[PDB]
Design an enzyme around this catalytic site. Structure first.
Site: not given
Ligand SMILES: Nc1ncnc2c1ncn2[C@@H]1O[C@H](COP(=O)(O)O)[C@@H](O)[C@H]1O
Ligand SMILES: Nc1ncnc2c1ncn2[C@@H]1O[C@H](COP(=O)(O)O)[C@@H](O)[C@H]1O
Ligand SMILES: [Cl-]
Lengths: 284, 285
Positions: A39, A151, A180
Site C-alpha cells: 500500500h 494494485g 510488491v
Molecule cells: N502487494 C501489493 N502490491 C501492490 N498493491 C497492492 C498489494 N496488495 C494490495 N495492494 C492494493 O492495495 C489496495 C487495497 O488492497 P487490500 O490490501 O487487499 O484491501 C488495492 O488497490 C490492492 O490491489
C-alpha cells in the site's frame, strides 16, 4: 505540511474545494486500512503524479457478501497513519460507514459494471463488485482526483474500475501499480500472516510456477487450457490445493481472442488458512 | 459567442479552461427539440453561475419503447439558434457512438433504487436507470457547480436529488417551475406527436388536474375517488389514462396526517403521445 486526518464529509468537502480552487492536481489511493508496504508503493506512485495525495481508509460494507466479515476486519487507524505520514500522504480520509451510507445498504444508489462484475471472482460473490464500483465512484465524486492508484494485485478490481471510468466519463488517470514482492517473489498480502512457518517457505512456489508459464507465452506458446492443467499439478505436487486458474484478456477478462493485445495469468491456490493469489501480464 | 462542442475531448478542454478562469458552471441537461420551457431553465441557470452548459442528447438508455426513440424529434440547428438568444455559453451535442461506443449491453449504469421502480418508474420500467446513468456521466464530464431541472419531470428531479445525496456529488440541484402554452398545455417535445385535432384536446389534461386540485383546496381527501373521477373525465374527452397518483410533495409516499403539501401526478395517452403533468396542492388551512 503536517498530514491532515479527516473523518467527516463536511470537513472533507471544505478541503477538496480549497485544493480544486487552488488548481492542485489531486491523486487518490483507496484502501480499507490494515496497511503494509504494498500500500505504501501506491502512495509513492501517487506522489509522483500529483501535487497532493489523498488516501482513503474505509472498510466498505457494500462489498462484503457476509455482513459479519465486517465485524472481523482489522481496524488499525493509528498504525496506518504512522505509515502514511512517512510516505508523504497529504490527507487521510477515514469516515464512519453511517456517514457514507446513512440511508442503509439496500436502497443506496449504486454503480454496476456489467459482465466484469459477475465473471471470475464475481461469479461466487454476488454483489461484491457492485459494492466496489459504487464506493469508488462515490470517492471519485467526493475527492475529484486527477489520478487514482490501484494494485495490480487485485486485478479484476483494477479492470472493473478502468471500465467504469471509461464508461462513466471520469477524467481520471487510473494507475495500476505492480505487486510488491518479498525477495522470495511472494506477493505481499495482509493474509500472508495466517501461513505457518513451514508454509511461508512453500509460498514462493506460486510466483515461480506462474512465471514459467509467462516465459512460454513470450516465446509464442498459446494452448491455454493445457498450460493451466500443468500448473494445477505443479502446485498439487509441491503442497498447494489449487482453486481454478485462468488466462484471460487483460482488459475484459474474457477468453483470449485473435484481437487481444495483452493477457493476464490469474493464479489462485490454497495453503493452510490462506487463499494465496498472484497474477502476471503478458504482451501479445 | 456561444460554442458548440460534439466531442468529449474538446468538451474537457473547454471545461478545464473555464475552471482555470475561476468560473462557476451551471449545467442544463436536455434531449433537444427545445421549446420555451427549456429556455426558462437556461435563463434560470444564467442567474446561478458564470457560464451555462446546455446538453442536447437523445439518450437511448432511457427509452423503453423503440418506436419512441426512432421518432423522437431532432432539430439541432433550430435548438442552437434559440440557445444563442438565451445566452447559453456552450451547447454539448454528442453522438451516441461517442457516449456509448460499445452500445448499451455492457454499458456501466447507475440505478437509484429508492425512486426508480415506483410511480412513473413503475409505468416506465428501465427508463430511470437511463436517466441516472446519463446524468451521472454528464456530471462527471462537466463537474458543474449547479444543475437545473424542470418540475415538469417531478419524480426525475427527486431521483436526481437522491443520486446526488447518495453518490457524493458536490452539485446544487435546482428545480424550475413548469412552462405552459397559453391554453395551459405543459410544453414538451412529445407534443409534436399529437395530431392537430388531438392538440386541441390536450389542454383538458391540465383542466382536469386543476379541477382535482380545486376539490382538494376545498378539503376533499378521498384520494382513490378523486383519481377515479379524473380518470373518468380523461376517458370522456378521448385520453387513455395511465396510472395517476396523489402523494406527499416532499417524499412521494402516500399522504399522511403529517403531510403539508401534496403533488398530483398525471399521465395519459392521447394518440401517440404519453403526456404527463403535475400540480402541487397546499394542504394547509
Ligand atoms: N502487494 C501489493 N502490491 C501492490 N498493491 C497492492 C498489494 N496488495 C494490495 N495492494 C492494493 O492495495 C489496495 C487495497 O488492497 P487490500 O490490501 O487487499 O484491501 C488495492 O488497490 C490492492 O490491489
Ligand atoms: N414545459 C416545461 N417546463 C419546465 N421545464 C421543462 C418543461 N419541459 C421540459 N422541461 C425540463 O427540461 C429538461 C429537459 O427535458 P427533456 O428535453 O424533455 O429531457 C428537464 O429538466 C425537463 O424537466
Ligand atoms: Cl424519456
Amino acid at each position: 505540511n503536517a498530514m491532515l486526518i479527516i473523518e467527516t464529509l463536511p470537513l472533507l468537502r471544505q478541503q477538496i474545494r480549497r485544493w480544486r480552487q487552488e488548481g492542485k492536481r489531486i491523486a487518490l489511493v483507496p484502501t480499507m486500512g490494515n496497511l503494509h508496504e504494498g500500500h505504501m508503493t501506491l502512495v509513492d506512485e501517487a506522489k509522483t503524479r500529483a501535487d497532493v495525495v489523498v488516501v482513503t481508509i474505509f472498510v466498505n460494507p457494500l462489498q462484503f457478501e457476509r455482513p459479519d466479515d465486517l465485524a472481523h476486519y482489522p481496524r488499525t487507524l493509528q498504525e496506518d497513519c504512522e505509515k502514511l505520514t512517512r510516505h508523504g500522504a497529504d490527507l487521510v480520509f477515514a469516515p464512519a460507514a453511517a456517514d457514507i451510507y446513512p440511508a442503509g445498504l439496500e436502497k443506496q444508489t449504486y454503480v454496476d459494471v456489467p459482465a466484469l462484475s459477475t465473471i471470475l471472482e464475481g461469479a461466487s460473490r454476488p454483489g461484491h463488485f457492485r459494492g466496489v464500483s459504487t464506493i469508488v465512484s462515490k470517492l471519485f465524486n467526493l475527492i475529484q482526483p486527477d489520478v487514482a492508484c490501484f494494485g495490480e494485485k487485485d486485478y479484476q478490481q483494477l479492470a472493473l474500475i478502468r471500465k467504469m471510468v471509461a464508461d462513466m466519463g471520469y477524467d481520471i488517470n487510473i494507475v495500476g501499480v505492480p505487486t510488491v514482492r518479498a525477495k522470495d517473489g511472494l506477493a505481499l498480502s495482509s493474509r500472508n500472516g495466517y501461513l505457518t512457518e513451514e508454509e511461508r517457505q512453500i509460498a514462493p512456489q506460486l510466483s515461480k510456477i506462474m512465471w514459467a508459464l509467462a516465459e512460454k507465452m513470450a516465446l509464442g506458446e498459446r494452448q491455454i487450457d493445457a498450460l493451466l492443467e500443468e500448473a494445477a499439478a505443479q502446485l498439487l505436487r509441491v503442497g498447494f490445493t489449487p482453486d481454478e486458474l485462468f488466462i484471460r484478456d487483460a482488459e475484459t477478462l474474457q477468453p483470449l481472442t485473435v484481437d487481444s493485445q495483452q493477457a493476464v495469468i490469474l493464479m489462485a491456490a490454497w495453503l493452510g488458512k490462506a487463499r494465496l493469489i498472484d497474477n502476471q501480464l503478458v504482451d501479445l
